[PDB]
């Protein structure tokens, strides 16, 4: 760090963020060069596909839940101005 | 007798010709699990058996088929699994066997000896200090 | 009392999953390929477009 | 006709399709005959509307059996073009299903309108 | 004698399928509708179910596999071994399966709920399914004869 | 019962019969509903405005 | 108010709609040269008058009220000729009436234009409206699903060839219809035809000139060359 | 008086697309079906 | 790479093979069998099987005896097209095209395609007569023989008109009519070439119903699409576009309007000019000129359909009168008012009758 | 028209195809002791029963 050269050039510098300083980064700055964590902007059409799948799972769970609920409420009745 | 033919022009091999059509192994997670088990089969037989040190960096063979031990005509009284004993995956079988108690005890032991004094101990010293 | 507690938890389960079903349908609305009314924005504006899906 | 519990009263049908437009803006709504059947089999069915204008009646005469077995209100209203064009789909709809929610003014209106179908009953 | 028994048994069932549901047997196949009623339990039972569910009869193990793991959902049921889907390719096969299922729903509700004055011919009883057969055959030929995708044709210089 | 009013706020207040099977009834929500008695069906509705005599907007 | 009104083609009668909806529209016919109440027509609906127009004679006329109810009404009988339903229109907003060589007893005009608050355009032939008896449920000569929102203004050509119609919520909702083929003209207007959020459409007298006006204060003009 | 007939090219090409090039109805009856699709009669 | 593109142009222009592998490849490109046998095929047994098919075909139809003399001989064994001069090759090419027009009817059959196999594997017809062979199998666009032809054509040899199959030659699949006709719409020259082939067929009297039915569908949807764009809305533009259209369709439509020997192509010309009338807002003089050539050219088997055409023509005419010889031949029409009532049962013949009585 | 005969008949079709094929392989092994080339060349089981008849 005392023998850097300021005008290096790479290709990483075309494809990573930079550390920078507190000046532009803020409270939250060590001089780490971040990367990804793994996930990206996942574009819309695939997201719709995800949503449909999640819908299917949730509806089917509502199915099993309602069957269970009706059975349990029935059994709750069978456990426990009406007569004229 | 002679007709017009069909033209049908539209990587590594997939069924090995010189081993009677063993297909390329599909990568499914339970299969991966079984492979990990058979590599680490040493520690499974904790104490009583030892094994040939099969050591490649990878462990997945390119060609393998999950199968079934069929039958012993000369012996089926005790070399036959019971109906409850039969399992889908080898990992669930070695689960459903005994001695997983001894596994868990060894687990708590090794876990403690890697939690010897690394950070929790330093924190408690720090409490004995700051008090 | 025990069965009643079980029914209370079960009805909570039904209500939560139902609200989830509502959320998923309205999400399909918000990201649908054309315009379509429905739900709110984050500011609470209940969406309304009289335009019809042709 | 088999179309027995029939609502052809113009005041009632106009209130009904107004509520349907409310349901198509509030997305509490399943459109298409298979969707209606899905709604009632899944038991989210609060109310079921079908139009009389079906070219065969027997293609939609399967539901009111299920409505009977599942204790729900349902009603016949005149025209498929009417039912579609109020839903805002611009096609021929012969079956719409409007489901309940936890709390809504739309829910209150649905309870009112099922009270009105119960009155016709 | 067993095989001849199966043969005449199939002939019997063909007569009976023609009897039970003219739309269904004229559309999709007698043994096909036989599989459907077999899963159904009864004909009113099958006519209770919506059309996409008709499309996903039978394969329910794969269905709930996929629904439990958010996999891709399976595309059809006994409809594959039905005939009319046999002539397509891939996505074509899927689209004809869906639309075929919709008309199957309509036709089976027709056969189980349209009353007839009993001086009603089989052809006026099954004209619904014949309508479906013609319209879906034209649908098949159009979806198959989707024109392919053109391109910039090069010379020997690529020109 | 032939038919009841769709609304819960309509009172049937005056009866007459134009034909053997066509019944005309004046009714509280400013209407005169025309029914046919055979299948209890509804021929028509006639309307009456507000009383532009002031409030009480039911005729 | 004095909001809606129509003047007869013979310039004789002025009809003014009423601010009393309450179950059915009503309106007053006026002798124009004397400016006097001469008649009243009232139909039973849900929210009063949507639109209305005389026939080609100037003796009878048509009300369309909301929920799509159209009523023909002649003066010599001084009553409603009859009622029918614009097919499946859940609520109308605009109507117009034009044409020649139609039913002379219904005013000799050929075509009726119905624009509904969904945004569908129902066009019918009054010679097909006949059964003096009336089809309670007429069939569409031509139904038009080429604009999404409710149509704002529609108008007939004088000659009985062209039908201009537009909605105002969208940018430049305006298409054009040829009679009696009853289809759109698929080559006008472009996206970059500078109409505006259309509000007013007038054919010329001689049917050579189109005038349109948006909601901004900029009217523009076209030559209709045949 | 008259004008031109609008018609779906989908209708026309389907009218030819009911069958392959050979094994067709005879040319006169096909032509009749064409002209009848192209009739301006009410 | 300038000289590289120039040598590439030459390599396109190259015809006879000049290194051993290229020789083997073009030698093995065949029709009936597979290339692995085709490479170890020699002319002799090839001549045997194709001659068996050729004798079957000449037993079916008489008119194959000229190429029994000139193109299916023991000398037709040895003759290699590449070794003779351009006028010899021109005469040979004419013999080819004449046989192709001769053979175009019986296309879907095994002995005929055996003959085709001799054409390729001896005379390199797939390379030397790509256009005429391609057109003459073009009306069979859903059969695997056509698929195999598409398999073994050379791509840079396919005509500029014909370069539409390139997606299909990348992916072997029989292309459909919609594709061919869409190229006919926004590619006039395909229509030009197929028109030229089929008119040569009827001029050599070797027309056949599959051919003419294909050609009817082709012209009808083609000119339909042509007007379906050519309507622009701009005034002189639509006039000039109709001009250019007329220039394109001129020769073929006149030859088919007065093709006296072939009633089927008369009916097809009736079809194309009828759609030309009813759709396109053509001018009355051009319309009456169509009327006049149809009048000049009909027959009695074509009589009633031509009457339908005149109903169309005068019905879309704007003036009220007919020009002479039309009325002359309608006097020559045998059963006038009976046929006219039969057609007005579905066709609205009123302007035709009015122009008649005026004349 | 009733469905109980239908459900029973299709169950018959399933089990008949089952035991059909198993007796097919069974008689293939049965006569293959006297003549294996029949199972080697002709795989179609109805014709197999036909020819052993």
Sequential DSSP letters for C14-39: HHHHHHHHHHHHHHHHHT-SS----S
The answer to whether G150 and G167 are in contact (CB under 8 A) is: yes
Cα(G7)–Cα(G51) distance, rounded to whole angstroms?
A: 13
Q: What share of chain B is helix, strand, coil (3-state, %, to 5)?
A: 40, 5, 60
Q: Is the peptide bond before G189 cis (omega within 30 degrees of 0)?
A: yes
C-alpha dist (Å) from residue E108 to A82, D2, E33, E94: 47, 19, 9, 21
J25 contacts chain E (CB < 8 A): no
Alpha-carbon gap, residue I181 to I176, rounded angstroms: 9
CA distance F42 to F38: 11
> DSSP characters for F1-59?
-----SSSS--EEEEEESSSSEEEEEETTTEEEEEETTTTEEEEEEE----TTSS----
**Within chain E, where are the H helices?**
2-20, 22-27, 30-40, 43-48, 51-55, 60-69, 91-113, 122-144
Among residues G16, G36, G35, G34, which one has the least CA distance to residue G26? Answer: G16
Residues of G in contact with C54 (CB under 8 A): 145, 148
Question: What phi, psi does G142 have (nearest 5°)?
Answer: -155, 130
Q: Which of F1, F5, F6 to mutate to test the interface with D (most CBs of D within 10 A)?
A: F6
For residue G134, the cross-strand partners are: G130
If you count them, how many residues does chain C have?
Answer: 54
Quote the CA–CA distance of D60 and E51 in Å, as a whole number: 12
Rounded Cα distance between J36 and E64, Å, is 46
Give CA torsion, residues G201, G204, G205, G208, to 10 deg: -140
Is the alpha carbon torsion for E45, E47, E48, E54 positive or negative? positive
Residue E98 C-alpha from the chain's centroid:
8
Burial D64-78 (b: 16+ CB within 10 A, else e): bebbeeeebbbbbbb
Which one, of I96, I87, I81, I85, lies nearest residue I129 by Cα?
I96
Q: Whole-angstrom Cα distance, residue B17 to residue I60?
A: 50
Chains I and D touch (3+ CB pairs under 8 A): no
Radius of gyration of chain J (CA): 15
Q: Are I115 and I54 within 8 A, CB to CB?
A: yes
H22-27: long-range contacts, CB 8 A cutoff, minimum separation 24: H22/I108, H22/I140, H22/I209, H22/I210, H22/I213, H24/I209, H24/I210, H24/I213, H26/I209, H27/I209, H27/I212, H27/I213, H27/I216, H27/I264, H27/I267, H27/I268
Q: C-alpha dihedral over E81, E84, E85, E91, to 10 degrees?
A: 180
- Calculate helix-pair angle for I263-278, I235-257, nearest 10 degrees: 170
Task: Flag if J13 and E43 touch (Cβ within 8 Å).
Answer: no
Number of inter-chain CB pairs under 8 A, C vs D: 23
Mutate to test the interface with E, among I159, I179, I187 (most CBs of E within 10 A): I179
Q: What is the DSSP string of I4-28?
A: HHHHHHHHHH--S--SHHHHHHHHH
| CA separation for the pair I341, C45 (Å, rounded) | 69
I293's enclosing H/E stretch is helix I284-297
How would you classify the pairing of strands G79-85 and G69-74? antiparallel
Burial of D100 (0-12, 13-18, 19+ CB in 10 A): middle
Q: How far is CA C5 from CA A77, D102, E61, in A?
A: 14, 21, 34
Instruction: With both helix axes pointing from N to C terminus, report the angle between I144-152 and I130-137 in degrees, rounded to the nearest 10.
Output: 160
CB of D25 less than 8 A from some CB of C: yes
Question: CA B82, CA B86: separation in Å to the nearest integer?
Answer: 6
CA angle E6, E12, E13 (to 5 degrees): 90
Chain G residue numbers with beta carbons less than 8 Å from the beta carbon of D81 are 87-88
Token digits of residue A22: 């507190």
**Alpha-carbon gap, residue J14 to J21, rounded angstroms:** 11
Structure tokens at F6: 């769709």
Give yes or no for a contact between F48 and G21, defined as CB atoms under 8 angstroms apart. no
What are residue D45's DSSP bridge partners? Answer: D99
CA–chain centroid gap for C52, Å, is: 21
What CA–CA distance (Å, rounded) separates I131 from I162? 8
Residue F36 Cα, gap to closest chain G Cα (Å): 17
Q: Which residues of H touch I224 (CB under 8 A)?
A: 9, 12
Q: Which of I138, I184, I161, I170 is nearest to E151 (CA)?
A: I170
- A49 touching chain C per CB within 8 A: no
Whole-number Å distance between alpha carbons of I27 and I33:
13
Chains B+D touching (3+ CB pairs under 8 Å)? no
Distance between E131 CA and the closest CA of chain J, angstroms: 23
Residue E36 has a CB neighbour count (10 Å cut-off) of: 26
CB–CB of C21 and A58 under 8 A? yes
Residues 22-41 of H with CB under 8 A from I: 22, 24, 26-28, 30-32, 34-36, 38-41
CA distance G67 to G89: 6
How far is G204 from G222, CA to CA, in rounded Å? 10
Q: How many CA atoms lie within 13 A of C33 on its CB side?
A: 6
Compute φ and ψ for I32, nearest 5 degrees.
Answer: -75, -60
Classify residue G207 by its DSSP letter: S
In this complex, do I233 and G225 lie within 8 Å of one another by their Cβ atoms?
Answer: no
HSE value, Cβ hemisphere, 13 Å, CA-based, for H5: 22
Instruction: For tokens 């390199």, name the residue.
Output: I124
Cite the beta strand spans of chain D per DSSP E: 29-31, 45-51, 74-77, 95-99
Please name which of I346, I353, I259, I342 lies closest in space to residue I314, comparing C-alpha atoms: I353
Q: How far apart are CA I101 and CA I111, in angstroms?
A: 16
How close does chain G come to I346, measured CA to CA in Å?
19
Say how many residues make up chain H: 42
* Best CA proximity match to I274, nearest among H9, H4, G183, H41: H4
Instruction: Residue count of chain F, please give it.
Output: 59
C34 part of contact set with chain A, CB < 8 Å: no
Bridge partners of G210, per DSSP, are G203, G222
Measured CA to CA in angstroms, residue G168 lies from A74, C54, G185, G198 at distances of 56, 17, 19, 5
3-state secondary structure of I332: helix
CA B106, B107, B108, B113 torsion: positive or negative?
Answer: positive
* Residue G41: strand pairing partners: G27
CB neighbours of I217 closer than 8 A, spacing ≥ 6? H16, H21, I177, I181
Which E residues 105-144 touch I at CB under 8 Å? Answer: 144
Residue of G12, G21, G137 lying closest to G87 (CA atoms): G137
Please say whether the dihedral angle defined by the alpha carbons of residues I3, I4, I5 and I9, taken in this order, is positive or negative.
positive
Residue D1 CB-density burial (10 A; 0-12 exposed, 13-18 middle, 19+ buried)? exposed
* CA dist., res. D22 & res. D20, Å (int): 5
Bridge partners, residue B16, by sequence: B22
Beta-carbon separation of C15 and D102 below 8 A: yes
Tokens of E14: 């063909």
In the structure encoding, which two tokens stand for residue A63, read together? 């199915």
- Which chain G residue has its CA at the smallest distance from H40's CA? G181
Chains in contact with C, where contact requires at least 3 CB pairs less than 8 Å apart: A, D, G
Strand order in the sheet with D29-31: D29-31, D95-99, D45-51, D74-77
**Chain-centroid distance, C-alpha I30:** 25
Listed in sequence order, the residues at least 6 apart from G13 whose beta carbon sits closer than 8 Å to its beta carbon are G7, G29, G30, G31, G32, G38, G54, G58, G75
Among the listed residues I134, I143, I59, the one whose alpha carbon sits nearest the alpha carbon of residue I108: I143
Question: In chain D, helix, strand, coil percent, each to 5?
Answer: 50, 15, 35
Cα atoms in the 13 Å half-sphere on the side-chain side of C6: 13
**Three-class DSSP category at G177:** strand
Nearest Cα residue to F5 out of J16, F13, I31: F13
Sign for the CA dihedral angle at I151, I153, I159, I160 comes to positive
**Phi, psi at residue G153, to the nearest 5°?**
-135, 140
- Is D38 in contact with E50 (CB distance < 8 Å)? yes
d(CA E132, CA E103): 6
Two structure tokens written together for D51: 């139009």
Partner-chain residue, chosen from E149, E153, E156, that has the shortest CB–CB distance to I9: E156
Sheet with F22-27, edge to edge strand ranges: F12-17, F22-27, F31-36, F41-47
Beta carbons of G120 and D86 less than 8 Å apart: no
| Residue with the two structure tokens 């004449």 | I98
Distance CA G28, CA I139 (A): 71
Please give the C-alpha separations between residue I115 and each of C49, I54, I208, in angstroms, as whole numbers. Answer: 69, 6, 19
Q: How far is G168 from chain H (nearest CA, A)?
A: 29
Resolution in A: 4.4
Cα distances (angstroms) measured from residue G21 to each of G24, G45, G150:
5, 8, 21
Gap between the Cα atoms of A23 and D93, Å rounded: 62
Give the torsion through C-alpha atoms of F10, F13, F18, F22, to 10 deg: 40
E143 closest CA partner among E81, E102, E99: E99
Say whether residue A62 is in contact with chain D using an 8 A CB cutoff: yes
Q: Which approach determined this entry? A: cryo-EM
Distances (CA, A) of B102 to B37, B85, B90, B91, B114: 17, 21, 19, 17, 18
Q: What share of chain I is helix, strand, coil (3-state, %, to 5)?
A: 75, 0, 25
Residue D78, C-beta contacts closer than 8 angstroms, at least 6 positions apart: D8, D13, D51, D52, D53
Place of tokens 């179309």: D3
Closest residue on chain E to J8 (Cα)? E38
Query: How far is Cα of residue G19 from the mean position of the Cα atoms in its chain?
Result: 20
- Does C have 3 or more CB contacts under 8 Å with G? yes
Residues of H with CB under 8 A from a CB of E: 14, 17-18
Q: How far apart are CA D34 and CA E103, in angstroms?
A: 12
Sequence-separated (6 or more) residues with CB below 8 Å from residue I128: I15, I81, I89, I93, I96
DSSP state of B18: G
Report helix, strand or coil for D73: coil
- Nearest in space to I162 (alpha carbons), one of I145, I172, I143, I175: I175
Q: Contact, G31 vs G38, CB < 8 A?
A: yes
């003959």: which residue's tokens?
Answer: I115
**What letters, b where the CB count within 10 A reaches 16 and e where it falls short, cover I30-50?**
bbbbebeebeebeeeebbebb
Question: CA-based diameter of chain I, in Å?
Answer: 78
Residues making up chain G, counted from first to last: 226
Which DSSP category does G104 fall into?
G
H or E stretch at G73: strand G69-74
Structure tokens at H34: 């064409």
If one counts every other C-beta atom within 10 angstroms of the C-beta of residue I333, the result is 17
Quickly tell me which residue has 């079988």 as its tokens: B93
Burial (0-12, 13-18, 19+ Cβ within 10 Å), B93: middle
Which of B53, G67, C45 minimizes the C-alpha distance to D14?
G67
Q: Which of E8, E40, E1, E2 is nearest to E21 (CA)?
A: E40
In the structure encoding, which two tokens stand for residue F39, read together? Answer: 């299948």
Dihedral Cα I241, I246, I252, I257, nearest 10 deg: 140
Q: Are E52 and E77 in contact (CB under 8 A)?
A: no
Report the alpha-carbon distance of residue I248 to residue I230 in Å, rounded.
13
The burial class, CB within 10 Å (0-12 / 13-18 / 19+), for I357 is exposed
Residues 6+ apart with CB under 8 A from H39: H5, I346, I347, I348
Q: Is I100 helix (H, G, I), strand (E, B) or coil?
A: helix
First to last CA, chain D: 17
What does the alpha-carbon distance between residue B26 and residue B14 come to, in Å, rounded to a whole number? Answer: 11
Angle between helix I284-297 and helix I303-316 axes, rounded to 10 deg? 170
Asked if the bond preceding G180 is cis, omega within 30° of 0, the reply is: yes
For residue A53, the chain E residue with the least C-alpha distance is: E70
Contact F35, F42 (CB under 8 A): yes
- Sign of the alpha-carbon torsion through I348, I349, I352, I357: negative
Q: DSSP 3-state assignment of E75?
A: coil
């Amino acid at each position: 760090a005392a023998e850097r050269n300021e005008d290096e050039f790479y290709f990483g510098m075309m494809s990573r963020k930079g550390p920078g300083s507190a000046l532009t980064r803020g409270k939250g700055f060590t001089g780490t060069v971040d990367g990804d964590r793994g996930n990206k902007a996942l574009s819309v059409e695939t997201v719709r596909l995800l949503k449909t799948q999640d819908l299917g799972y949730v509806r089917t769970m509502r199915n099993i839940a309602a069957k269970e609920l009706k059975e349990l409420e029935e059994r709750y009745v069978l456990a426990g101005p009406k007569k004229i | 007798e002679l007709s017009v033919r069909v033209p049908q022009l539209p990587g590594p091999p997939d069924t090995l010709s010189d081993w009677y059509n063993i297909p390329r192994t599909n990568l499914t997670p339970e299969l991966k699990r079984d492979l990990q088990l058979l590599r680490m089969r040493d520690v499974v037989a904790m104490g009583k058996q030892f094994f040939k040190k099969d050591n490649r960096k990878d462990f997945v063979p390119e060609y393998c088929q999950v199968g079934t031990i069929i039958a012993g005509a000369t012996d089926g009284v005790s070399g036959r699994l019971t109906r409850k004993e039969r399992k889908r995956t080898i990992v669930e079988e070695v689960l459903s066997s005994d001695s997983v108690s001894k596994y868990k005890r060894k687990y708590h032991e090794i876990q403690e000896h890697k939690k010897s004094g690394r950070k929790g101990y330093y924190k408690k010293l720090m409490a004995a200090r700051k008090r | 009392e025990k069965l009643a507690r079980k029914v209370k938890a079960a009805r909570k389960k039904l209500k939560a999953l139902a609200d989830a079903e509502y959320e998923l349908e309205l999400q399909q609305a918000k990201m649908a390929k054309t315009a379509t009314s429905g739900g709110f924005t984050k500011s609470g504006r209940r969406i309304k477009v009289r335009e019809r899906k042709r | 006709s088999a179309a027995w519990p029939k609502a052809e009263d113009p005041a009632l049908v106009q209130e009904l399709l107004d509520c349907v437009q409310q349901a198509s803006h509030y997305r509490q709504l399943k459109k298409g005959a298979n969707e209606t059947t899905k709604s009632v089999n899944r038991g989210t069915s609060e109310l079921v509307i079908l139009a009389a204008d079906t070219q065969p009646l027997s293609i939609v005469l399967h539901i009111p059996l299920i409505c009977e077995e599942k204790n729900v209100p349902y009603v016949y209203v005149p025209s498929k073009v009417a039912l579609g064009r109020a839903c805002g789909v611009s096609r021929a709809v012969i079956a719409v299903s409007l489901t309940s929610n936890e709390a809504s003014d739309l829910n209150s209106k649905i309870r009112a309108l099922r009270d009105k179908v119960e009155r016709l009953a | 004698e067993r095989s001849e028994y199966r043969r005449q048994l199939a002939e019997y069932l063909q007569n009976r399928m023609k009897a039970i549901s003219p739309n269904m047997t004229e559309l999709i196949g007698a043994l096909v509708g036989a599989r459907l009623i077999a899963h159904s339990g009864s004909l009113v039972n099958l006519a209770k179910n919506p059309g996409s569910t008709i499309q996903i009869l039978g394969a329910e193990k794969a269905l709930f596999r996929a629904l439990k793991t958010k996999h891709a959902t399976p595309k059809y049921g006994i409809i594959y071994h039905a005939s009319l889907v046999g002539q397509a390719s891939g996505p074509n096969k899927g689209k004809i399966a869906r639309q075929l299922a919709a008309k199957i729903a309509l036709s089976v509700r027709t056969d189980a709920f349209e009353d007839f004055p009993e001086n009603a011919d089989d052809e006026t009883r099954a004209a619904v399914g014949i309508q479906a057969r013609a319209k879906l055959e034209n649908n098949l030929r159009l979806l198959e004869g989707k024109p392919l995708n053109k391109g910039v044709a090069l010379g020997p210089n690529g020109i | 019962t032939l038919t009841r009013t769709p609304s819960k706020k309509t009172k049937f207040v005056s009866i007459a019969f134009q034909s053997h099977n066509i019944v005309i009834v004046g009714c509280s929500n400013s209407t005169i509903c025309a029914y046919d008695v055979r299948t209890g069906t509804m021929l028509r509705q006639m309307t009456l405005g507000t009383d532009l005599t002031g409030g009480s907007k039911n005729i | 108010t004095m909001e809606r009104f129509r003047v007869s083609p013979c310039g004789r009668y002025m009809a003014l709609v009423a601010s009393d909806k309450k179950g059915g529209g009503m309106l007053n016919i006026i002798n124009v040269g004397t400016m006097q109440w001469i008649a009243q027509a009232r139909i039973d609906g849900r929210h009063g008058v949507a639109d209305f127009a005389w026939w080609s004679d100037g003796n009878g006329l048509t009300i369309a009220g909301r929920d799509g109810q159209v009523t023909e009404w002649s003066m010599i009988t001084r009553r409603t000729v009859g009622i029918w339903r614009d097919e499946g229109s859940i609520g109308g907003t605009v109507m117009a009436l034009g044409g020649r060589n139609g039913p002379a007893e219904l005013g000799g005009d050929r075509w009726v234009a119905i624009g509904s608050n969904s945004g569908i355009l129902n066009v019918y032939d009054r010679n097909d409206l006949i059964e003096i008896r009336i089809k309670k449920y007429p069939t569409p000569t031509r139904v038009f699903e080429q604009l999404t929102t409710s149509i704002s203004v529609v108008a007939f050509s004088p000659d009985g060839q062209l039908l201009a119609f537009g909605s105002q919520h969208k940018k430049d909702a305006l298409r054009l219809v040829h009679l009696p083929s009853c289809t759109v003209y698929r080559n006008w207007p472009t996206e970059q035809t500078p109409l505006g959020r259309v509000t007013a459409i007038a054919f010329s007298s001689k049917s050579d000139v189109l005038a349109v006006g948006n909601d901004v204060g900029r009217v523009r003009l076209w030559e209709i060359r045949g | 008086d008259t004008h031109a007939v609008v018609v779906a090219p989908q209708r026309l090409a389907e009218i030819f697309n009911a069958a392959p090039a050979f094994a067709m109805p005879p040319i006169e009856d096909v032509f009749y079906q064409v002209a009848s699709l192209f009739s301006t009669k009410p | 790479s300038s000289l590289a593109q120039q040598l590439a142009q030459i390599a396109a222009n190259s015809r006879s093979s000049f290194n051993v592998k290229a020789l083997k490849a073009s030698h093995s490109k065949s029709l009936i069998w597979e290339p692995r046998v085709a490479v170890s095929q020699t002319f002799a047994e090839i001549y045997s099987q194709c001659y068996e098919g050729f004798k079957e075909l000449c037993h079916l139809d008489s008119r194959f005896v000229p190429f029994d003399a000139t193109l299916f001989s023991a000398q037709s064994q040895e003759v290699d097209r590449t070794q003779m001069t351009a006028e010899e090759n021109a005469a040979l090419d004419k013999r080819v095209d004449s046989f192709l027009h001769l053979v175009g009817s019986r296309l879907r059959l095994m002995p005929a395609i055996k003959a085709v196999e001799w054409l390729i594997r001896r005379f390199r017809i797939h390379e030397f007569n790509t256009g005429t062979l391609l057109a003459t199998f073009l009306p069979y666009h859903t059969i695997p023989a056509f698929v195999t032809l598409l398999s073994i054509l050379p791509v840079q040899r396919i005509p500029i008109e014909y370069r539409f199959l390139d997606p299909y030659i990348k992916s072997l699949t029989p292309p459909p009519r919609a594709a061919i006709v869409q190229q006919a719409t926004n590619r006039p020259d395909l229509l030009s070439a197929i028109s030229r082939y089929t008119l040569d067929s009827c001029r050599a009297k070797q027309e056949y119903p599959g051919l003419i039915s294909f050609w009817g569908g082709i012209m009808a949807e083609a000119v339909n699409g042509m007007i379906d764009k050519m309507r622009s809305g701009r005034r002189a533009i639509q006039l000039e576009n109709d001009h250019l259209l007329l220039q394109q369709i001129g020769p073929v439509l006149s030859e088919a309007m007065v093709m006296k020997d072939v009633p089927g192509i008369q009916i097809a010309s009736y079809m194309v000019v009828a759609i030309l009338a009813a759709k396109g807002s053509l001018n009355d003089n051009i319309l009456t000129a169509f009327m006049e050539q149809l009048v000049h050219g009909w027959t009695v088997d074509t009589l009633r359909p031509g009457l339908v055409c005149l109903t169309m023509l005068a019905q879309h005419r704007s003036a009220k009168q007919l020009s002479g010889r039309v009325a002359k031949a309608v006097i020559k029409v045998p059963d006038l008012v009976s046929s006219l009532r039969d057609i007005s049962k579905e066709h609205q013949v009123d302007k035709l009758a009015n122009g008649l009585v005026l004349a | 028209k009733v469905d109980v005969m239908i459900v029973h008949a299709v169950a018959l079709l399933d089990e008949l195809d089952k035991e059909l094929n198993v007796m097919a392989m069974r008689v293939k092994e049965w006569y293959g002791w006297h003549f294996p080339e029949l199972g080697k060349i002709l795989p179609d089981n109805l014709s197999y029963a036909r020819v052993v008849l």
